[PDB]
Structure formats: structure tokens, C-alpha cells
């Protein structure tokens, strides 16, 4: 599977669903559909967390990378599982929405890059060794 495509299709779905434009996301698919529905379910179960995160990020172009790294380290500090990976995608979405809300749309390209590099380097071994995206689809698809 393709981590860049998974990130691109997720961020495009989340932003387009809420009326936000991301030019670079303008457009195997059972993975995208499964992640979409898992993420939407996560968002519904933890709306209060979705709301507190959006209201406190306080992004600027120079602090965006540090805010992303700080949250993602805390998310995986106790270990990785599929639910924390889904939460990682939803947090990336929140970062992208808040970037546009604060007139920093170019930051969406950076956030998508950071998310991809994170799957490619930090989370890669865990995802592969726990069955890859195919296991994720079999468990939650
Ligand atoms: C600084 C911070 C670190 C502070 C903390 C927080 C917020 N926290 C993050 C961690 N969190 C977690 C973590 C793990 C799990 C879990 O059970 N893990 S699990 O057992 O592996 C699994 C279990 C079920 C499914 N799927 C169900 C299917 C049912 C049928 O429909 C399809 C889906 C999956 N799965 O992967 O799909 C995997 C979980 O519970 C659930 C429950 N329901 C879920 N539905 C989808 C995912 C999911 C997880 C919730 C709780 C909220 C921060 C925060 C804030 C805002 C944003 Cl925006 C983000 C983060 C920041």
C-alpha cells in the first residue's frame, strides 16, 4: 500500500466534507473507505476531544511542526495500536482545518508531508509487523 496516497485521500475527504479547499489533494480503495469510516466513528465517539484540540492548537507557521511533534509523541507514548493510528489521522485533520481557519492554508501541505514521513519512518515497522493495512481492513472494515 501507499502511505502518501492514504494520507492524501484522507485529508482531502476530511477537508472537502467541511467545505475547505486543499488544491494538492484534488483527485486499494477499501483501505481508504475503511480509514474514512473508522476516523468518522472516532470523531463521533470523542467529539469533546476533537473540540478541545481545535480550540487550543493556536497554530503559527513557525510553531506548527513543534505542535504536531508534541501531540503525536504524547499520542504514542504508551505504545502503538490501530486506534491510536486512527486518532493520529484525525489529529492531522484537525491541524489542517485549523490551519485554514487561521489563514495558513499552505501549512496543509506541510502537515500532509509530516503525516506521511511519520507513517514511513516512525510507524512503519509496527504497521508491517502487525499485518499491514490489510490486517486493519480485516479487523475494522
Ligand atoms: C494529547 C492527546 C494524546 C490526548 C488524548 C487524545 C484523545 N484520545 C486519543 C486516544 N483515543 C483512543 C485510543 C485508542 C482507542 C482504541 O480502542 N484502540 S483499538 O482498540 O486499537 C481500536 C478499537 C476500535 C476501532 N474501531 C471501531 C470500529 C467500529 C465500527 O466502525 C469502524 C470503527 C479501532 N480502529 O482502529 O478502527 C481501533 C480508542 O477507542 C476507539 C473507539 N472507537 C474507535 N473507532 C475508530 C477508532 C476508535 C478508537 C480511543 C482516545 C482519545 C488526543 C487527541 C485529541 C483529538 C484528536 Cl482529533 C486526536 C487525538 C491527544
Residue numbers in the entry: 9 to 35, 90 to 203
Which text from the study accompanies this structure?
Four or more hydrophobic amino acids on successive helical turns within the BH3 motif engage complementary pockets (P1 through P4) in this surface groove of pro-survival proteins. Venetoclax competes with pro-apoptotic BH3 motifs for BCL-2 binding, releasing pro-apoptotic proteins and allowing apoptosis in cells primed for death.
Additionally, we obtained a structure of BCL-2 G101A bound to venetoclax, representing a milder introduction of bulk at the G101 position than the valine substitution. Additionally, introduction of an alanine at the G101 position did not provide sufficient bulk to displace E152 in the crystal structure and affinity for venetoclax was maintained for the G101A mutant.
